[PDB]
Amino acid sequence: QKMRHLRFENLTEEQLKRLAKILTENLKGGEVVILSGNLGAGKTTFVKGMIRAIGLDEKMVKSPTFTLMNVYPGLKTIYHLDLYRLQDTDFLSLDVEDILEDEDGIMVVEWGDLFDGFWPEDSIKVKIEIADESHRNVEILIPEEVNFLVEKIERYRKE
Amino acid sequence: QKMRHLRFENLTEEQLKRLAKILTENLKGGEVVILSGNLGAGKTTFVKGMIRAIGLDEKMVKSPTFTLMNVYPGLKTIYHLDLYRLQDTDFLSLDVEDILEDEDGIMVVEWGDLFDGFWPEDSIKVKIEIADESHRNVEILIPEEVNFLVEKIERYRKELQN
Amino acid sequence: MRVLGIETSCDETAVAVLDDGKNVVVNFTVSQRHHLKNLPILLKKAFEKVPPETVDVVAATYGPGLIGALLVGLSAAKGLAISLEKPFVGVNHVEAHVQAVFLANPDLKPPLVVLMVSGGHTQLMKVDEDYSMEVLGETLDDSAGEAFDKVARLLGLGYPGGPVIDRVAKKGDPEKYSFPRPMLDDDSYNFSFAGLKTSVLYFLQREKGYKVEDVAASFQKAVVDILVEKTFRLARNLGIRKIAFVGGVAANSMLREEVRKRAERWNYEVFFPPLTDNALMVAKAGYEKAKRGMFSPLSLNADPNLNV
Amino acid sequence: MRVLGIETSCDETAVAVLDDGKNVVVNFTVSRHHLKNLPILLKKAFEKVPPETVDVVAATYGPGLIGALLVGLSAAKGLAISLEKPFVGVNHVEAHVQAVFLANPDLKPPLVVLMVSGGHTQLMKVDEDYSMEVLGETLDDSAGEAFDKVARLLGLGYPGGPVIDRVAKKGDPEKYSFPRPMLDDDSYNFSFAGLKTSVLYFLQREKGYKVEDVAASFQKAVVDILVEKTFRLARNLGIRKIAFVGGVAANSMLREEVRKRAERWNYEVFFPPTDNALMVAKAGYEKAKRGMFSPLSLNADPNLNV
Amino acid sequence: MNVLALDTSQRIRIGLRKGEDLFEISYTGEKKHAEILPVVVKKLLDELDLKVKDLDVVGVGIGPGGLTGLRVGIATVVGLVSPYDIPVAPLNSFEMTAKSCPADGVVLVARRARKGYHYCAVYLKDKGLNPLKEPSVVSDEELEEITKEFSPKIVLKDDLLISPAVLVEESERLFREKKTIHYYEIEPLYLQKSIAELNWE
Amino acid sequence: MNVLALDTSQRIRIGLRKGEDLFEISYTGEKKHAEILPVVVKKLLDELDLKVKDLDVVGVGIGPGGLTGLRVGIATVVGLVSPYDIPVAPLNSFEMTAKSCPADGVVLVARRARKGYHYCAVYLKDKGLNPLKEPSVVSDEELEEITKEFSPKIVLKDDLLISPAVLVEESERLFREKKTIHYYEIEPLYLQKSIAELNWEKKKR
Numbered sequence A: 001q002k003m004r005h006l007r008f009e010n011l012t013e014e015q016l017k018r019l020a021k022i023l024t025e026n027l028k029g030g031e032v033v034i035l036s037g038n039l040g041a042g043k044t045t046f047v048k049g050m051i052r053a054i055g056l057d058e059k060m061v062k063s064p065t066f067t068l069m070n071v072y073p074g075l076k077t078i079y080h081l082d083l084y085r086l087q088d089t090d091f092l093s094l095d096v097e098d099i100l101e102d103e104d105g106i107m108v109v110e111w112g113d114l115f116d117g118f119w120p121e122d123s124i125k126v127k128i129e130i131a132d133e134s135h136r137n138v139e140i141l142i143p144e145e146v147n148f149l150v151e152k153i154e155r156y157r158k159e
Numbered sequence B: 001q002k003m004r005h006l007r008f009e010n011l012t013e014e015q016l017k018r019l020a021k022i023l024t025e026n027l028k029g030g031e032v033v034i035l036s037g038n039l040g041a042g043k044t045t046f047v048k049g050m051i052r053a054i055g056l057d058e059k060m061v062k063s064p065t066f067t068l069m070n071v072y073p074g075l076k077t078i079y080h081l082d083l084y085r086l087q088d089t090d091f092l093s094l095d096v097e098d099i100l101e102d103e104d105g106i107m108v109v110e111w112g113d114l115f116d117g118f119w120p121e122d123s124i125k126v127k128i129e130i131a132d133e134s135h136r137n138v139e140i141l142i143p144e145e146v147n148f149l150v151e152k153i154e155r156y157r158k159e160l161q162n
Numbered sequence C: 001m002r003v004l005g006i007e008t009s010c011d012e013t014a015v016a017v018l019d020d021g022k023n024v025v026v027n028f029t030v031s032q033r034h035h036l037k038n039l040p041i042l043l044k045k046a047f048e049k050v051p052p053e054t055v056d057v058v059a060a061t062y063g064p065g066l067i068g069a070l071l072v073g074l075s076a077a078k079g080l081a082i083s084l085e086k087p088f089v090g091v092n093h094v095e096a097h098v099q100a101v102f103l104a105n106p107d108l109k110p111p112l113v114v115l116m117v118s119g120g121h122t123q124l125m126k127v128d129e130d131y132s133m134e135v136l137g138e139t140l141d142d143s144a145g146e147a148f149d150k151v152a153r154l155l156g157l158g159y160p161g162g163p164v165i166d167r168v169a170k171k172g173d174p175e176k177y178s179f180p181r182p183m184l185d186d187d188s189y190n191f192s193f194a195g196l197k198t199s200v201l202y203f204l205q206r207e208k209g210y211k212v213e214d215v216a217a218s219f220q221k222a223v224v225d226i227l228v229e230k231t232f233r234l235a236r237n238l239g240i241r242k243i244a245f246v247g248g249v250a251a252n253s254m255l256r257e258e259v260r261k262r263a264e265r266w267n268y269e270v271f272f273p274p275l276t277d278n279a280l281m282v283a284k285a286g287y288e289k290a291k292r293g294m295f296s297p298l299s300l301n302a303d304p305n306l307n308v
Numbered sequence D: 001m002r003v004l005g006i007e008t009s010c011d012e013t014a015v016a017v018l019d020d021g022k023n024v025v026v027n028f029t030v031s032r033h034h035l036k037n038l039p040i041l042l043k044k045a046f047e048k049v050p051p052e053t054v055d056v057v058a059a060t061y062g063p064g065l066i067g068a069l070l071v072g073l074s075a076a077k078g079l080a081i082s083l084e085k086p087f088v089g090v091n092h093v094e095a096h097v098q099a100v101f102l103a104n105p106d107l108k109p110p111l112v113v114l115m116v117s118g119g120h121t122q123l124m125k126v127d128e129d130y131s132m133e134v135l136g137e138t139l140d141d142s143a144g145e146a147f148d149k150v151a152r153l154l155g156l157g158y159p160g161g162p163v164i165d166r167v168a169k170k171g172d173p174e175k176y177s178f179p180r181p182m183l184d185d186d187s188y189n190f191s192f193a194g195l196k197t198s199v200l201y202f203l204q205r206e207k208g209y210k211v212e213d214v215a216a217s218f219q220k221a222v223v224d225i226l227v228e229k230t231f232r233l234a235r236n237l238g239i240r241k242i243a244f245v246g247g248v249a250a251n252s253m254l255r256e257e258v259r260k261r262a263e264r265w266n267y268e269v270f271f272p273p274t275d276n277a278l279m280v281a282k283a284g285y286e287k288a289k290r291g292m293f294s295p296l297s298l299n300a301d302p303n304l305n306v
Numbered sequence E: 001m002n003v004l005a006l007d008t009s010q011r012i013r014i015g016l017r018k019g020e021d022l023f024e025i026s027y028t029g030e031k032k033h034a035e036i037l038p039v040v041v042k043k044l045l046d047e048l049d050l051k052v053k054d055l056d057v058v059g060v061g062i063g064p065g066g067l068t069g070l071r072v073g074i075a076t077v078v079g080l081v082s083p084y085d086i087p088v089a090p091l092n093s094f095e096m097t098a099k100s101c102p103a104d105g106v107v108l109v110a111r112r113a114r115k116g117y118h119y120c121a122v123y124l125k126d127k128g129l130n131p132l133k134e135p136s137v138v139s140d141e142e143l144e145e146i147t148k149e150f151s152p153k154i155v156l157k158d159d160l161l162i163s164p165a166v167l168v169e170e171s172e173r174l175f176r177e178k179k180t181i182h183y184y185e186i187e188p189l190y191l192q193k194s195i196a197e198l199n200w201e
Numbered sequence F: 001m002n003v004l005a006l007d008t009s010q011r012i013r014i015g016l017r018k019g020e021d022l023f024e025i026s027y028t029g030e031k032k033h034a035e036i037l038p039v040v041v042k043k044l045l046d047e048l049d050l051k052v053k054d055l056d057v058v059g060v061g062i063g064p065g066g067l068t069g070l071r072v073g074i075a076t077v078v079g080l081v082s083p084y085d086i087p088v089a090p091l092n093s094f095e096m097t098a099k100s101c102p103a104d105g106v107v108l109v110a111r112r113a114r115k116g117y118h119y120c121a122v123y124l125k126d127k128g129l130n131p132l133k134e135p136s137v138v139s140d141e142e143l144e145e146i147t148k149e150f151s152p153k154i155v156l157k158d159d160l161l162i163s164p165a166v167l168v169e170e171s172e173r174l175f176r177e178k179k180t181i182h183y184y185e186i187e188p189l190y191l192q193k194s195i196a197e198l199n200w201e202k203k204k205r
């Protein structure tokens, strides 16, 4: 299946956060969220926005570059991956595979554009590009969720 | 109710005990032995000779007329019953039935003949009769367990000249 | 020390609550058969009067008796221990009988000999100064009670044999006929009665125009001789002049007389019970053990052939 | 007191036997896959040391990876059960701090310490009773992370830190003036994500620059924000003994700038000279003699701190 | 809620539920019921730190089984709950056996009795068991007849296996559906008595 | 003889045989494996008065199951038997599930994985356990094809039942047949390897 792309040009930091909130508060359990973006793109600060939807502080979202995995246990459990410093594939094979068995918890993956083969086909892809020093562009791919894309285009239309 | 009878005549006390031993040591387990015989026929005395085969003392064999059932835990388990005093059938129905599910414990019932219907069809009947003041007669009813008959007839030879 | 006692050793079911000594707060019996059906009822009625939180110790007979009957009281008692979070005492029933001699007479000297004669029990036992006891004499065959009952049957007299033989022998002539005293003049304090029983059977098989009254009395005297000799002989060889009689056949007027006659001659204290209360007997025995802080483990199995 | 130490928090799997906290009787290291490796190492250990001799078993219960930790933690409790000896679950961060007092025998209990590494950047107070709390903490990236990712951005090899260290020596700091993201705040917290991106923006904008100059100016940014917040806290808590633990503590620029500030203001500053398998045993031994053992019901938590 | 359930029909099966924690214990050995049942109940209650008075309901296996086993069982429970009149959930042992099987369908439960007689029942285990044939005694030949009539999928013979978890569930269910009894109302399944009468007839 | 067997592939399952005594324990609760397994093994061994060194073999469930569960499991055993090199009996979790069922015949065992995938084996249990299809990862569709093909009598899915008594029997069997291994030889059944590799092929197609 082919996901509906929802483009967003020149978002501020808080606008980007708010979007992350809107998305995550609106999905059900057991979804994968692939964050694509190069260094400096708000991959991790997007997850700040995400944690708002699980009624936790933004302060506890921190880069998993070294920790490899952060889990935020809230209204829903968020698994925050950062594949930047991944050396051993077996972590995906075993550990990450074991998480994908969780049927009511969300996974977001910084640098999840690596190892394309691995992720479930119906994964939510999120791409972030640098517009200027204080603005970003994001395009969100969501596959055939009647309720999802509708709730997202609302904020797209709320520009 | 006719099966293989093994008559013996004018047995002394120790001859009767030795017969009890020779019968019981040849039992496999989970068999019922009904002792018929009038008062002082020599039933409890026969169970005295039965306990030899479970390598215990004869001294612990005592009439269970009041105790209802004695249990002798030896090389096998002997359930010595005495239905002389029994008045409530439920004891047979519950307590005795439960025991009959045991596959490798011997049961010997002084005055079993009183409740004839209750017992399994494959029961070993032992009838005792008082020949004289010091001698008794025993007959053993055994149905199809031809194995034991061989060992019991061997005894006959030891009693040949008495 | 509120001690709850359960009795399911044979026949009537029983529950009693007792205080420090003889301070009966509650004593319920079934007699006023089917233990498992009965026991809950009794425990209900007991807890209706006594608050359960008050009981300090739970005690029940662990033998001797019927494996099946015993298990009901034994098991229930352990459950009561577990729920109440109090200690449990598994009592010996023969020791309980003996204990009640000291209960029935508060001022009794510890060093004591005791004959126990009933259906299904015939023994001689020594009680030490510290109240420990061993069985020194024992029936190898039938009990004196059995002899009485089975002989009464042979005479065609209603149950129980003891009372009947007792009554009819009063009109009969003892030692009209002379039946053996099987174990008399032994080195031992042990008893046999099966030889006496069959003897009577032979006499009745070699029938005559005998009186039944005569046979009964002659049998009775035979038994009361062998009971008196071995009891007094021991008490002698042990240097005790206090001797107590317990069990059903202890009610035999012939024995009572013949003991009393022989205990007038030698200054000997003889103790008989009155012409019951099986629940309290357990509670007492429990309390006694509780005081010495001798409690029973929860892994305690019932054995039907408990003695000593 | 022979203490057996298990390490499955770090990438190397390790098993160490230590006598009295100071004597290595045996130290085995794999040199990753903990469940495959650990049994081999325990084999090798028990071939040399007799099992009866072990007095206490010790392993890390966090922080780290839930999966990596459980293997060591789980194994140690089993050893504890089978040996019939007590078990100590060691807090890894706590153990690092205690090694400052191990390196320096004559060290006063009241101390302030900066932990600056990859994925760890915090300021902690050590009380007199040797209890410790985290007072300052990074909200975004670690300092080490900033070094590694900025090095990448600059087009410099791994590892970020030592490479940026070396190239900055040929450069002029304060040539360019990057932001000090949390400096002059009412908090002892740190931020580095802002700094990291600021470098990127400069790399996108400017053209004529020297790499040496950018590196040294970025380094001096970081080393300013580290030095200020560290000495500010030491001041407001009246402690003049301060210790620098962690990977980026290696940085010669930081070392110099700390030393300068610690000659003017009269302060004692302590730096490190790590061994992993022993450090667990050493922490275990230390807790064992205070009779402070861990329950068998202890789960691993991967975000253990303080 | 807090539930203690136990069945002593064959082996000793004890389930205990305290809030979110469900423990199952079983025993098979030489040791008799009387010497092993109370020992475990005591320790398990100690370990979960709960007094009997803290129990909501206590389930007991009464269904067809070994007389002396059932006796030890029911008695034990009577002792535990008598001081507090805790709701008792009578459990059919044969039903507990069938319900303990993972697969569904037509299930025959068959245990040996004296000399070629059997305790026997058969059920349908879709969601909860529905009884096809009520528990009763049968001959060796009558069992075989029952076997071919019903063509059972699962046959539980002699070595009946009860999960204590099942016992707990059932108690919970019986407590909910207001079908619990007092300790003085317990009626066992005395299937053995029949055997004598059926032999005659 | 003395045998301890455990499987933590799903719930905590512990069997312990001391001569003529067999004790079984299961735990279903919110507590994690790491919180409960050692605690019980300690208590059961204390209560039976059994040193670990007294054990003759220790069975361990390795077969397809939850990663965290199997890890706590295997590692615990590694710790228990390492000081004494006690023979280890590796136990295929599924096979134990199949054997745990009373009925005989064709048996399918299944466990959910990553959405749209399943761990799956099928066995013939008639006389002994004869493997019809070995444990492997299958797509939701491929499972249904297998069900149809093998027409199984018993289906065990999602909520597996393992009898600790069965775990012991198997350990004893394995001990008899000289099929036990050292604690440093254990190789788990990580079916979560296959699933990533299949996703790639079918994601491309």
Ligand SMILES: Nc1ncnc2c1ncn2[C@@H]1O[C@H](COP(=O)(O)CP(=O)(O)OP(=O)(O)O)[C@@H](O)[C@H]1O
Pocket: A011, A012, A013, A014, A016, A037, A038, A039, A040, A041, A042, A043, A044, A045, A046, A063, A065, A084, A110, A133, A134, A135, A136, D140, D141, D149, D193, D194, D195, D197
């Ligand atoms: N529109 C915007 N959205 C997000 N962040 C923005 C932004 N404008 C500016 N920023 C700044 O950009 C920085 C984003 O940092 P991070 O979220 O760490 C990027 P990342 O992609 O997660 O890093 P990584 O590539 O090292 O993993 C913050 O300092 C933030 O304030």
Ligand SMILES: Nc1ncnc2c1ncn2[C@@H]1O[C@H](COP(=O)(O)CP(=O)(O)OP(=O)(O)O)[C@@H](O)[C@H]1O
Pocket: B011, B012, B013, B014, B016, B037, B038, B039, B040, B041, B042, B043, B044, B045, B046, B063, B084, B110, B133, B134, B135, B136, C141, C150, C194, C195, C198
């Ligand atoms: N040949 C013989 N065999 C057995 N006993 C003999 C005997 N000759 C004499 N006796 C005696 O006869 C008596 C046998 O009686 P017991 O067996 O003790 C009672 P019972 O026959 O079991 O019937 P009961 O149920 O009425 O008590 C003993 O005194 C025994 O010594």
Ligand SMILES: Nc1ncnc2c1ncn2[C@@H]1O[C@H](COP(=O)(O)CP(=O)(O)OP(=O)(O)O)[C@@H](O)[C@H]1O
Pocket: B066, C097, C117, C118, C119, C120, C121, C144, C145, C146, C148, C149, C160, C161, C162, C163, C166, C247, C248, C249, C250, C251, C252, C253
């Ligand atoms: N007046 C009497 N004379 C002789 N024997 C008597 C008697 N009154 C009762 N008995 C005997 O006493 C026996 C019954 O005793 P009970 O006291 O009723 C129970 P028990 O048999 O004593 O039980 P126990 O020995 O298990 O404690 C019977 O054998 C009966 O014949």
Ligand SMILES: Nc1ncnc2c1ncn2[C@@H]1O[C@H](COP(=O)(O)CP(=O)(O)OP(=O)(O)O)[C@@H](O)[C@H]1O
Pocket: A066, D116, D117, D118, D119, D120, D143, D144, D145, D147, D148, D159, D160, D161, D162, D165, D246, D247, D248, D249, D250, D251, D252
């Ligand atoms: N001389 C130096 N100068 C500056 N940074 C340095 C450095 N040596 C190492 N670093 C940095 O320190 C980090 C690695 O620190 P280490 O403590 O060795 C492992 P860590 O990943 O930081 O451990 P942690 O998980 O306990 O935080 C890297 O980001 C590296 O660039």
Ligand SMILES: [Mg+2]
Pocket: A043, A044, A063, A064, A065, A082, A110
């Ligand atoms: Mg990041």
Ligand SMILES: [Mg+2]
Pocket: B043, B044, B063, B064, B065, B082, B110
């Ligand atoms: Mg007799």
